[PDB]
């Protein structure tokens, strides 16, 4: 448990990738969760209304998914700021700031 | 009707229906040309049908109450 | 694949653009963010041989 | 569905007949007429990229497929990426214009390193 | 499915480099290497 | 009255580069020192159109397919093209779409008309044969080395006929000048009739016939995205095809004539199913 | 502003511009749009 | 490109509130993006419906305009304290901080 920092940016992107996924196979209250199905089984009035329902499920998901990646990224940038400040101020000189 | 400018009234000119203030405008049309639209596609010039003249249609003063 | 989904999807718009766009300046960002903890000299200095 | 057949390693029990990976989708299947697996492929998704100078300077341009074999799109292969209108070149400069990959893009047509 | 996985700018080879640089500068030059010529 | 013309001379079509010609205005908007994208049926930039000529022995008066819109490009003097047949069976069976514009005005027929083999007008120094059954008729005012060049767009969109039209002065004597003119719309007819087909109507000259000195041009009118430059005076100047090459695809998405250096993702690759594979 | 030498006319407000900006300022002012 | 910085919240700013206009112009699945046309062209009962429709899409599109706000806000209210840091411990004394 030495580089857990590391492992749970890895874990989180990865988690959230395979959610972003695991969305697609929900139906979000339309007949099926695949757009094939609704293109052959049905006309194009109900369809509409089908892929409406699978459309918005699925934007909903992605929408969750790039707010909680920006969250995600600005967590990551303060970090990756206070790694370059420490790369100036510890390796390239000798700090008096204690800790 | 008549044409009343520099009033916040509703105007509906050729099937094209909004509320704004109607002042004289300095924007030369082309003669095919009916309407008028900014960057954000929002109509703010456009043409009498009666009397070819150019009005430009400035949004009425909303703004918040603090 | 499906055309009649993009075709539907056109009617909501440029979310999909914005979606991207945040994508895009994440990617570019995790890039800045290494070249500023990284990249913090231009001299490749190398250690002596003995 | 839409995918690119390919000869599978796995090998599937009796009783089954498509295969599903970590994120429920279709990655393995076996042909109802000869008992055989195939894996299933996605066809080749990529983020198609420009890359050029100022208008001012020249109207050059190259194209990077991003993920993108070279053999199923001055063509060049990276790591980002197939490259096309780019000279690879094995000098080193400072970077220009990013592709990715450790490899940078410039103008001096335009070359790729 | 319309995801995609981009290689960042910098390979671990690059990045072990200027790691390099940044450890040969302190050893051999101390601190004056971040604030001038080493 | 119809006339057979057996004196024709073999030659094959010609064709030729479209440049940046064939853009028209989409709407009747006007714009402001805007860029402005929209996606309609225009023509594609260096594309190859096809080239026809009227010379002295050369009559070219084909049947043509229409599509989804036609481009007609005149290098003109004298006035020889005088109007357009439009159709689909161009026989009494259907009804068809007339436009000629003889020494007074323009005419505008939607009929039931016995179009000719050969149509054509004479000038001294025989189009159809019968009319049954009308339902449209419009009379307007006149539209009109090579001294005219004549710009027009045909689309049918939901029954609406839209002719757009440009007058422009050259003086180049063989082929179409390279330059930016934007079309203006002309004129809207509510026809709501079916198109397929098109024939150029000419005029002849007798002093047999002689066919005097002029050339046009077809193009065909494909669904892809402009991006529009409108200027503080509100005409279009320039334009970028989204679908040309990459750097016009840049400039498109990113709503600029002008790009920075650097890389810019502007679409995505696909690769197309090449077969159906269906296994039961 | 006698400061030995040292000539701060850049950075200092320029009392010819009526928004009193320093030359540096007024140039970072008018450089965005 | 000095002064690109700024520049860039400039052009972020005033392209997310093009983006929240141009929002307007879409219908989201209704008949028409403008409720006058569907208030003059159908009955309330359906009429409702095509407005429900621009309502929930107008009001997604201006969440995710707030939501990306909130998260640029929170990126430079981390930029302006760097700078009031700077200001403290560059301009109003001499820093031993290398860099
Ligand atoms: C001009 O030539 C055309 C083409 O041959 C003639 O059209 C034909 O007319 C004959 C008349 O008996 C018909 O049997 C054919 O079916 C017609 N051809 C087609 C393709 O429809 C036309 O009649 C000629 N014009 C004159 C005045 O003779
Ligand atoms: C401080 O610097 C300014 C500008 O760098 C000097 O002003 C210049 O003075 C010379 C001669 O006096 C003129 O030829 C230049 O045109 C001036 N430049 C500008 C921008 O005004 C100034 O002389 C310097 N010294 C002091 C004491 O102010
Ligand atoms: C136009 O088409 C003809 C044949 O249809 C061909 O011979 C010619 O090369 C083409 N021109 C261009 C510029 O592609
Ligand atoms: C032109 O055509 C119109 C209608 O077809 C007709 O009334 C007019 O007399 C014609 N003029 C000439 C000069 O043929
Ligand atoms: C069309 O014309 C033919 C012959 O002139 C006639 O018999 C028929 O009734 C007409 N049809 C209509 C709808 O007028
Ligand atoms: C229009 O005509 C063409 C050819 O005659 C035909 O294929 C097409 O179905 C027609 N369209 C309609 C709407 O009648
Ligand atoms: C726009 O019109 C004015 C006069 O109305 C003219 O002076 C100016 O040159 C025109 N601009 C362009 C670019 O043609």
Same mark, same amino acid.
């Given at each position: ?6 492992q &749970?940016?890895v &874990?989180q992107?990865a988690?959230?990738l ?12 339309a007949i099926?969760?695949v757009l094939?199905?609704?293109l ?6 109900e369809?509409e ?10 934007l909903?998901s ?6 909680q990646?920006?969250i995600?990224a600005?967590?990551?940038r303060?970090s990756?700021?206070?790694?370059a400040?420490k790369?100036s ?5 000798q700090?008096?700031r204690?800790? | 009707?008549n044409?009343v400018?520099?009033?916040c009234?509703?105007?509906?000119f =050729?099937?094209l229906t909004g509320?704004g203030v109607?002042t004289?405008s =300095?924007?030369?049309?082309l003669?095919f040309?009916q ?7 929002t ?11 150019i ?5 009425c003063?909303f703004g918040?109450v603090? | 694949?499906?055309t009649?989904c993009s075709?539907?999807?056109?009617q909501?718009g440029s979310f999909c ?5 945040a994508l895009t300046?994440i ?5 800045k963010?290494?070249?500023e ?8 200095y190398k250690?002596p041989?003995? | 569905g839409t995918?690119?057949?390919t000869?599978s390693? $796995? $090998?599937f029990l009796?009783?089954?007949?498509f295969?599903?990976?970590?994120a429920?989708?279709?990655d393995?299947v076996?042909?109802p007429?000869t008992?055989?697996?195939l894996?299933i492929?996605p066809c080749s998704?990529?983020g198609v990229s420009?890359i050029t100078?100022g208008t001012?300077?020249?109207?050059q341009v190259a194209?990077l497929?991003?993920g993108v074999?070279c053999?199923?799109?001055?063509v060049?292969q990276?790591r980002?990426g197939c ?5 690879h070149?094995?000098?080193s ?5 990013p ?14 390193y | ?6 290689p960042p700018?910098l390979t671990?080879?690059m990045i072990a ?5 940044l450890?040969?500068?302190?050893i ?5 290497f971040?604030?001038?010529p080493? | 009255?119809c006339?057979?013309?057996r004196?024709?001379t073999q030659?094959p079509?010609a064709?030729?580069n479209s #440049?940046t010609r064939?853009?028209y205005?989409?709407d009747?908007?006007f714009?402001?020192? +805007?860029?402005?994208?929209?996606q ?7 594309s190859?159109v096809t080239?026809?000529?009227?010379i002295?022995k050369?009559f070219?008066?084909? +049947?043509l397919? #229409? !599509?989804?819109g036609v481009?007609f490009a005149?290098t003109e003097?004298?006035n020889?093209?005088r109007?357009?047949?439009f159709?689909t ?11 000629v514009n003889?020494?007074?005005n323009?005419?505008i027929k939607?009929? %039931?008309?016995?179009?000719? !083999?050969?149509?054509f ?11 049954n ?8 005012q006149?539209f009109?080395?090579?001294? !005219?060049?004549? %710009?027009? +767009? #045909?689309?049918?969109?939901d029954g609406y ?10 003086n180049?004597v063989?082929d179409?000048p390279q ?6 719309p002309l004129?809207?007819?509510?026809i ?5 087909? #098109? ?7 007798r ?12 193009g065909?009118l494909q ?9 503080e005076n509100?005409?279009?100047?320039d ?7 990459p750097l016009?695809?840049?400039?498109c998405?990113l709503k600029?004539?002008?790009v920075e250096?650097?890389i810019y ?5 696909? +690769?197309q199913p ?5 296994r039961? | 502003? /006698?400061?030995?030498?040292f000539?701060?006319?850049?950075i200092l407000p320029?009392?010819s511009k ?6 540096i300022? /007024? ?7």
């Amino acid at each position: 448990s030495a580089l857990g920092k590391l492992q &749970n940016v890895v &874990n989180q992107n990865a988690q959230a990738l395979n959610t972003l996924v695991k969305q697609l196979s929900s139906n979000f209250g339309a007949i099926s969760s695949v757009l094939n199905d609704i293109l052959s089984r049905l006309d194009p009035p109900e369809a509409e209304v089908q892929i409406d329902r699978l459309i918005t499920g699925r934007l909903q998901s992605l929408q969750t998914y790039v707010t909680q990646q920006l969250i995600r990224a600005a967590e990551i940038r303060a970090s990756a700021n206070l790694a370059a400040t420490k790369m100036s101020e510890c390796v390239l000189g000798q700090s008096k700031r204690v800790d | 009707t008549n044409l009343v400018k520099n009033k916040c009234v509703n105007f509906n000119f =050729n099937g094209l229906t909004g509320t704004g203030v109607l002042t004289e405008s =300095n924007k030369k049309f082309l003669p095919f040309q009916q309407f008028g639209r900014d960057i954000a596609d929002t109509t703010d010039a456009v043409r009498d049908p009666q009397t070819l003249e150019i009005l430009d249609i400035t949004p009425c003063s909303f703004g918040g109450v603090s | 694949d499906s055309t009649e989904c993009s075709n539907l999807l056109l009617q909501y718009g440029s979310f999909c653009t914005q979606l991207n766009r945040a994508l895009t300046g994440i990617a570019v960002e995790q890039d800045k963010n290494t070249q500023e903890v990284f990249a913090q000299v231009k001299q490749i200095y190398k250690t002596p041989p003995i | 569905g839409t995918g690119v057949l390919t000869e599978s390693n $796995k $090998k599937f029990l009796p009783f089954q007949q498509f295969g599903r990976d970590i994120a429920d989708t279709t990655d393995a299947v076996r042909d109802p007429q000869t008992l055989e697996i195939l894996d299933i492929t996605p066809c080749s998704f990529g983020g198609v990229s420009v890359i050029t100078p100022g208008t001012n300077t020249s109207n050059q341009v190259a194209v990077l497929y991003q993920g993108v074999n070279c053999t199923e799109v001055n063509v060049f292969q990276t790591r980002a990426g197939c490259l096309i209108g780019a000279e690879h070149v094995n000098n080193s400069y400072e970077c220009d214009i990013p592709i990715g990959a450790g490899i940078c893009a410039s103008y001096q047509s335009i070359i790729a390193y | 499915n319309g995801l995609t996985v981009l290689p960042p700018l910098l390979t671990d080879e690059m990045i072990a480099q200027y790691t390099s640089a940044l450890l040969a500068g302190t050893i051999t030059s101390g601190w004056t290497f971040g604030a001038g010529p080493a | 009255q119809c006339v057979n013309l057996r004196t024709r001379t073999q030659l094959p079509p010609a064709y030729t580069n479209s #440049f940046t010609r064939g853009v028209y205005y989409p709407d009747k908007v006007f714009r402001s020192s +805007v860029l402005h994208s929209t996606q309609d049926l225009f023509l594609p930039f260096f594309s190859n159109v096809t080239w026809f000529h009227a010379i002295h022995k050369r009559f070219d008066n084909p +049947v043509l397919p #229409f !599509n989804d819109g036609v481009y007609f490009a005149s290098t003109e003097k004298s006035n020889i093209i005088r109007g357009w047949i439009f159709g689909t069976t161009l026989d009494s069976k259907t009804q068809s779409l007339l436009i000629v514009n003889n020494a007074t005005n323009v005419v505008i027929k939607v009929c %039931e008309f016995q179009f000719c !083999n050969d149509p054509f007008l004479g000038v001294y120094y025989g189009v159809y044969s019968s009319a049954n059954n009308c339902t449209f008729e419009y009379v307007s005012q006149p539209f009109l080395n090579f001294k !005219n060049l004549r %710009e027009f +767009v #045909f689309k049918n969109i939901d029954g609406y006929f839209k002719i757009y039209s440009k007058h422009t002065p050259i003086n180049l004597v063989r082929d179409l000048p390279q330059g930016f003119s934007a079309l203006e719309p002309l004129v809207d007819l509510p026809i709501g009739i079916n198109i397929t087909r #098109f024939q150029t109507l000419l005029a002849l000259h007798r002093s047999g016939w002689t066919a005097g000195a002029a050339a046009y041009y077809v193009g065909y009118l494909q669904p892809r995205t402009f991006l529009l430059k409108y200027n503080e005076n509100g005409t279009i100047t320039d334009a970028v095809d989204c679908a040309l090459d990459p750097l016009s695809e840049t400039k498109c998405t990113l709503k600029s004539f002008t790009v920075e250096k650097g890389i810019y993702q502007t679409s995505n690759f696909r +690769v197309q199913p090449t077969e159906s594979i269906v296994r039961f | 502003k /006698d400061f030995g030498g040292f000539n701060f006319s850049q950075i200092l407000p320029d009392p010819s511009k009526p928004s009193k900006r320093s030359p540096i300022e /007024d140039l970072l002012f008018n450089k965005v749009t």
